[PDB]
Amino acid sequence: MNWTVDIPILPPLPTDLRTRLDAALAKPAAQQPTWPADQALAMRTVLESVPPVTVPSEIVRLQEQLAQVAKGEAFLLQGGDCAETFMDNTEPHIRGNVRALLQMAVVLTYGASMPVVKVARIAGQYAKPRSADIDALGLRSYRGDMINGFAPDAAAREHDPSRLVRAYANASAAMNLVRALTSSGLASLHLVHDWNREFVRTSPAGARYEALATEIDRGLRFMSACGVADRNLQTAEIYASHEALVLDYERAMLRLSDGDDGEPQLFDLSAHTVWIGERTRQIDGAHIAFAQVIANPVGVKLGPNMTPELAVEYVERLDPHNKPGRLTLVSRMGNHKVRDLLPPIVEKVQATGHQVIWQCDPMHGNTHESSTGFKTRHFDRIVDEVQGFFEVHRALGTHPGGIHVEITGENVTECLGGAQDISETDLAGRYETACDPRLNTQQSLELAFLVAEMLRD
Amino acid sequence: MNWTVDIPIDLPPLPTDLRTRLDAALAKPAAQQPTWPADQALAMRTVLESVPPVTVPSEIVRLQEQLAQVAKGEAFLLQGGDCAETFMDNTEPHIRGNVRALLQMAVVLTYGASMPVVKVARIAGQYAKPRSADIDALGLRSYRGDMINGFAPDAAAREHDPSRLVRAYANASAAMNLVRALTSSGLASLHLVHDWNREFVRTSPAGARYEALATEIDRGLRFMSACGVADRNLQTAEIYASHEALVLDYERAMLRLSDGDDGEPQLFDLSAHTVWIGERTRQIDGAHIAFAQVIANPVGVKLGPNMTPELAVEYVERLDPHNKPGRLTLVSRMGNHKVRDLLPPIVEKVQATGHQVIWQCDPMHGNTHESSTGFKTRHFDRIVDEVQGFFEVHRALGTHPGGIHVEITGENVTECLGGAQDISETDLAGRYETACDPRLNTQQSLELAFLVAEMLRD
Amino acid sequence: MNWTVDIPIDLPPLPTDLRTRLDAALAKPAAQQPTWPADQALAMRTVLESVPPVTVPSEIVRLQEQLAQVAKGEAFLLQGGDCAETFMDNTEPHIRGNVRALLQMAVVLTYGASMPVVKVARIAGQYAKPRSADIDALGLRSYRGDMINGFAPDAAAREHDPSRLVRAYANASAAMNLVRALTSSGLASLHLVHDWNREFVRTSPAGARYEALATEIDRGLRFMSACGVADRNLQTAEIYASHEALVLDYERAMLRLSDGDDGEPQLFDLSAHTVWIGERTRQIDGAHIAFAQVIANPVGVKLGPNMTPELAVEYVERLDPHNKPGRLTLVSRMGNHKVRDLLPPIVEKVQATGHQVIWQCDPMHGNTHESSTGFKTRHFDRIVDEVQGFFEVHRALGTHPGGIHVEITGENVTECLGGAQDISETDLAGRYETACDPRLNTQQSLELAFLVAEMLRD
Amino acid sequence: MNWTVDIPILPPLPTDLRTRLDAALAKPAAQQPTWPADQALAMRTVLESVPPVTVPSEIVRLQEQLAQVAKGEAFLLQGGDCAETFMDNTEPHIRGNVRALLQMAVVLTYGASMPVVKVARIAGQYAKPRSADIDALGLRSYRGDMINGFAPDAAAREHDPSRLVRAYANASAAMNLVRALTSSGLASLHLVHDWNREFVRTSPAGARYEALATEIDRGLRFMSACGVADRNLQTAEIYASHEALVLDYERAMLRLSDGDDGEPQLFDLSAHTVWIGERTRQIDGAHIAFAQVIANPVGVKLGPNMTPELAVEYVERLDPHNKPGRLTLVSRMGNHKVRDLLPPIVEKVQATGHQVIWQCDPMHGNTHESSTGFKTRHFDRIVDEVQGFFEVHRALGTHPGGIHVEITGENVTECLGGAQDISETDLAGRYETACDPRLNTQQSLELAFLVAEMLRD
Numbered sequence A, D: 001m002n003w004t005v006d007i008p009i010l011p012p013l014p015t016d017l018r019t020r021l022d023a024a025l026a027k028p029a030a031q032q033p034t035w036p037a038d039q040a041l042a043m044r045t046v047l048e049s050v051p052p053v054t055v056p057s058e059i060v061r062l063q064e065q066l067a068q069v070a071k072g073e074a075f076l077l078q079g080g081d082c083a084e085t086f087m088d089n090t091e092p093h094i095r096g097n098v099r100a101l102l103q104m105a106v107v108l109t110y111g112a113s114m115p116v117v118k119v120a121r122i123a124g125q126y127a128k129p130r131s132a133d134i135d136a137l138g139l140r141s142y143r144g145d146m147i148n149g150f151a152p153d154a155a156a157r158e159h160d161p162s163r164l165v166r167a168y169a170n171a172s173a174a175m176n177l178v179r180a181l182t183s184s185g186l187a188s189l190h191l192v193h194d195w196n197r198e199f200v201r202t203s204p205a206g207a208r209y210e211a212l213a214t215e216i217d218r219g220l221r222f223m224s225a226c227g228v229a230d231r232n233l234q235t236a237e238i239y240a241s242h243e244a245l246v247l248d249y250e251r252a253m254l255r256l257s258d259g260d261d262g263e264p265q266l267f268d269l270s271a272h273t274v275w276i277g278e279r280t281r282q283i284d285g286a287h288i289a290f291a292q293v294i295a296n297p298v299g300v301k302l303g304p305n306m307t308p309e310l311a312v313e314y315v316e317r318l319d320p321h322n323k324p325g326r327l328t329l330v331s332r333m334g335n336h337k338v339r340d341l342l343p344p345i346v347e348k349v350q351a352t353g354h355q356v357i358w359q360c361d362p363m364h365g366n367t368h369e370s371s372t373g374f375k376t377r378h379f380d381r382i383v384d385e386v387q388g389f390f391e392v393h394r395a396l397g398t399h400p401g402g403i404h405v406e407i408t409g410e411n412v413t414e415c416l417g418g419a420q421d422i423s424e425t426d427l428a429g430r431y432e433t434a435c436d437p438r439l440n441t442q443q444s445l446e447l448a449f450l451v452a453e454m455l456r457d
Numbered sequence B, C: 001m002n003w004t005v006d007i008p009i010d011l012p013p014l015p016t017d018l019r020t021r022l023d024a025a026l027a028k029p030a031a032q033q034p035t036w037p038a039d040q041a042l043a044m045r046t047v048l049e050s051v052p053p054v055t056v057p058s059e060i061v062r063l064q065e066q067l068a069q070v071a072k073g074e075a076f077l078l079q080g081g082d083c084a085e086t087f088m089d090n091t092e093p094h095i096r097g098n099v100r101a102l103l104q105m106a107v108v109l110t111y112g113a114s115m116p117v118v119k120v121a122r123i124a125g126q127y128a129k130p131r132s133a134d135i136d137a138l139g140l141r142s143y144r145g146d147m148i149n150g151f152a153p154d155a156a157a158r159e160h161d162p163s164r165l166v167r168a169y170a171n172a173s174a175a176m177n178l179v180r181a182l183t184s185s186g187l188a189s190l191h192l193v194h195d196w197n198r199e200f201v202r203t204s205p206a207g208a209r210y211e212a213l214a215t216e217i218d219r220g221l222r223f224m225s226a227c228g229v230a231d232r233n234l235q236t237a238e239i240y241a242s243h244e245a246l247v248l249d250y251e252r253a254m255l256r257l258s259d260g261d262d263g264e265p266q267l268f269d270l271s272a273h274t275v276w277i278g279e280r281t282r283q284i285d286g287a288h289i290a291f292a293q294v295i296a297n298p299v300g301v302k303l304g305p306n307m308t309p310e311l312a313v314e315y316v317e318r319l320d321p322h323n324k325p326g327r328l329t330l331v332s333r334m335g336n337h338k339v340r341d342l343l344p345p346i347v348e349k350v351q352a353t354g355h356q357v358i359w360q361c362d363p364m365h366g367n368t369h370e371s372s373t374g375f376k377t378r379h380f381d382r383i384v385d386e387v388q389g390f391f392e393v394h395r396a397l398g399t400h401p402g403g404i405h406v407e408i409t410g411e412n413v414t415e416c417l418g419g420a421q422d423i424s425e426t427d428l429a430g431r432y433e434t435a436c437d438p439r440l441n442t443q444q445s446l447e448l449a450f451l452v453a454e455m456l457r458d
Ligand SMILES: N[C@@H](Cc1ccccc1)C(=O)O
Pocket: A004, A005, A006, A046, A049, A050, A051, A169, B087, B088, B089, B090, B167, B170, B171, B174
């Protein structure tokens, strides 16, 4: 059985915004679904009237907080599933990811001695690009639940535009629960840090992290001692992010803000912040041009073929007003390359006078296939890229601004290594990702401890 | 085609002992239930048993605390929103407008009551209604709300479709998502909300009547600021979600067990913060009351003009067996010509039980008539009068007039007669948009709040 | 014996460059100075150069900030207390009563002005006064305040005693100690202070006249609390100390250099937060104005009916050479029959300089007469009228009526005629306790605040 | 020359309070000044009308905060000059002592993981007892500035009742400045802890304290990172205390509170809290009986001849209502005796069901005369008594509640040892105390670091 929505049957956009949005979407767009234009149209028309996932005042606030990051006064933690699935979009799963993020953020806040902006990969991370249209089984590749189905059969892999509305319903339900959890005792600092004390007790390398975990606990107790109750603390904010990949979905979720900011602007209200991937960041393509029309903070992924000149051109197109925190440059080069490739990019971009956020994505540049047949990543390479990234920035005198990690609160066996010493054979036990291998809950927390030590050095 | 798209549907169950209790309670007869097949209902319940909840238990505990304060005479309850939410009107401007209307009332009422106002919206789930007549005036089976069937006057639309349970959830969670965002925003800023109230005074035909009180409120707000209170100092702005718990297939699917981190796990309906049981489904030995008994949420019961003092006491004993102030709200809808006579003996007998309920006034439901022009309508003056009569009752007994429960919208509709705009029978035809009962429009609802604030100040 | 006990008296000096500046300024002639021997004055100054300060520079910087807000039209200045403090009345009940009176006024004024009130007491140093007549009506040399000589009508007491400089300091620091404690206490709690205002309304003969405004204030306070503001949320309650800077031996001894932890060291008079220069000592080329020029404290100048617009501008140029809003307060005491005529040309000319002074009304000083029963007195109605005229002046020019400067006490004295109590010439004899000018008693001062709050609300 | 005050020429006390106050003062009183009764009377009559040094609402609040201490939920730091002098009652000196106390309190708060109640020996510590009426020079002994003069000549040593009013004027001026300093940037946590960072840089043992000082700094930064500004912190409270020694002064400074607490009570408004010394704690003497009539929190000094039974009797007389924090038992036994003498006292008092504060006074039991002729104390004995005191409590399972130390913000050379290795010969350079040797500013801060480590163990 299925549920059924009606196709609906405001004053138009300001003329200039229609023009610019049309011109952006007329450009070539890579990695798009291949479904009929008429059926896409119907689904976009449904989504043009739904309640938004986010609102403009939140995005404006995020932009403020990210400006602090870019100025060297805060740090950005971005993390969650590689690919959300409708099947796994449950309260236990969402809570776990929200918890894992909060757990990391408190460790990171302590180590950085500055605020941590928390951005989950959630409430929309339902689309992925692929280098191959045919996968290793000879099936049309799975592109995420917004496009087709994970099941390895041909009928499941057909692109289905009704997945756009299912995506939005899943996203909005998830966001609802994220808001509720963050305004609960879940986000209480003292609760979150007791979880961190259980980790130390039960990890095989818990002795290695005991001292920092105790220093944190002592820091929290000091706050309380000085007369700071929970009510004194601004409540926890977890923002929603995903890759802006499916332009039918992003364009349908655009909303025109008020002239309470001065000029009406387009905001993508599918999320607070979105990024553009390595396979869709064609400089004259639709995704970059779309990013130029929306008011949200944005990010661009930068891999090992990046040049300093092209990085500058992203800066100049996407932060044309010199607004710190509008743009995030995310670097994945792998651990064996970050120390050699990143510095020339950083130096050229810093010379422009613009202030981007420099964020490390350790995971994407460090993936291999195990002998047992699983797409995996070694924990030690993930840690080493972040280490290299910090070394780049320290030598320069620039700000290592944040990390972008794939994680879950589940005890998955997806990435090799960590204190639990996950082996190739262990991978088979709980390899649950619909896409890339995630740090499990313990490995994500171990990473935060390790990165906190980088911040303290 | 016919302008539809289908969306396909694809965790540990609740504990055995809890299920055994629930199964015993739900064996009771349930009035007004949809007539869809059991097997299809089961499949939809199973979907909904694993979805993210609309609300979470800590919010409901908090609401229970705030309602205890109401029941003790230290806070006032404002409950309002659409009579019937529809899927097609479940949009950003509409939701924003109803949230704004509620907040606009609440500030006027907070000022008049000199005490906090607990704000509960009829929203994010008010998608089912009872029908007295199985055949409507067009010869169709009756519209029962969007969770059951379609408003459109055609037989295919009116068939009871169990897939609407999921559509309802998706709508409710989306709406709640936006309510949370809005409340977290500048929308709930006191100063912003009260500027809207200043525009109302300047433009209303009876603005001169409300000017003095509106000025007194503005001077109050400006005094706060003068004393060195910024918005950041103010309590976070909370709008709770409520609806009539009617469709037991939905409500039972949305039950969850709280975690063990406070006292002990309790059973909550996480489709809303609070629910009520309506006049047509409040059979003492029926399934609706038995459901209300087993959940931990705060609950309400509508009490109309056939109520007896003895039956009201039996609600109190079934639904507040542990004597928890604020757990039970008794919602009086006598009508304006009967409230002064019927309510006191009910109040006296319940008060003698030792229990502390919240006494809430529903002015609207007892005061509905059909206009000569053919529209279901209510007179503004009879609404205002039932609230006046309710206050007189409580005044006289020394009990607390605890709140109001109204049907309102932020839209400039023409559904209720009267008010400062002097909506006539003829005006009704212009913007009669409700899928069910006539609502106070945005101006009427604000005027009601000013008039009730004067009742609170007497 | 004769009922006295003697108390025996037993650090790096200020920087040379600063001293050279000060020595040049103080070479100027100083009117109204005590006539005690130089050598004994020097010894007493030397004691006072090492004592703990009455105030500290961070408080004065903060006051300067708050006064800038007044000068910009965003806050209102309330300055009040005894005409002349005496050592013998420098007691806990008296100080408490004056602090209470000031706080009672300030809440009424804050509500009426819809903006913060900066509270400055005439206290902890108002121990010196000018005398026109070197011989008083009893044939004695005039009482000049307790810092100089004794009130008692006998020749030994009236001799100028330089030891009174130390007595004054000891009294001022003790009083300030208690003002700080009181302000840190429940005394400055809004809710406590405004309950006192409710008792005034119930017991005053004109209480019916003020009832409505008093109720509106109470509803304002209760709204704050309803919105979830507790006392702990409120700004800390600040009462600043002021007096007329008259005795330059005291003022110069109490100068200190701020430390280097903000901008650069500045020279402050730490005998008070703010001082003013009176009508008899404001010679443009005299030592009082030159002293005011060199200190960093906010300062005031009294402007009486001989003032010219040109002389007022010369005060502005000498005393606010850096164009710092709030640094200079111009305190008008025209009298009620002259303020509407004399003040506007002064205001227009000063406003044309580009500088932002605070315009403050001293109703009391221009409105003093001798009763037929032989008491120096003032009529309540002429006091209220000068403030009314001051507001009319500023209204008309679009300038800000910035504050009032009144003489008041928390005691139930009989010094000023009129008010709701209808104090008569005959009543004056009952409790005429001032060592100098007649003060508003506690009821009169509160009534004035209600009347001025109505001026602010028009 | 001298300044001159007038002898003044409320409804009487409730009858029962007059009775009890008369009965208390009729008891024998040790260590009183010998000045004529008539002249004393005149001075008491002046002091009965002066503005009080403290007010009852402050004392009630202190009693709340001390109840937290007694329950094991806060710690008490009490410190300042051994004897204040009129000559040294200056802004530079007061500020220094207030700073030194604040500096210690932040270190202690961090180490204790709980609030620190800060009580200065100030604004009245002008009277001292003496074992001998004739000192080593053959002069009538100096008893503090409230009684006679420090100068070593016979005329200066005569007891002068006018010193009562001079004392009060000095006390009130000092209290005024203490209030002003604590509501200033002086008491800002971040300012206070930068001073602690200079100490670490310039101390000879700074390397030993670097790690804790950095952990504190990181704790402070974490607070700021989590969104706690100064405005969020309740402002710093420093309470005033002294030995209640001169009964002419204490009785004259009594004030009757309101019936806003229910029953009118007598409060000694010369201070917030006072203590009774080893030489005046006669169980049936006037000082203990006076302590029983006033509502202030009080303390009793307990030296090495104390017994468990007599400790209990102080408890039962002075905390007859079982009000936690009303009574503080202060132990000085010396470092070589505390571990053996204190436990039996603690065990018997804990068995009563009453909750006193257990406070260590390291200095008084550990004084000796140097070969160079200076009354002095070794830093290492001071530290060791506190160590012993903590060991007593830990074995018991009771709460080491606080310390009572003699300190100054001046760089004095009065106590031997510390990281600066003050020698007998160094003593001569800046031996400025009018009475017992104080920890100087560095030694007081080193002590706080050391006691913080005891708290953390
Ligand atoms: N209200 C529309 C769109 C919608 C679908 C699902 C969730 C939220 C909105 C419908 O039900 O058809």
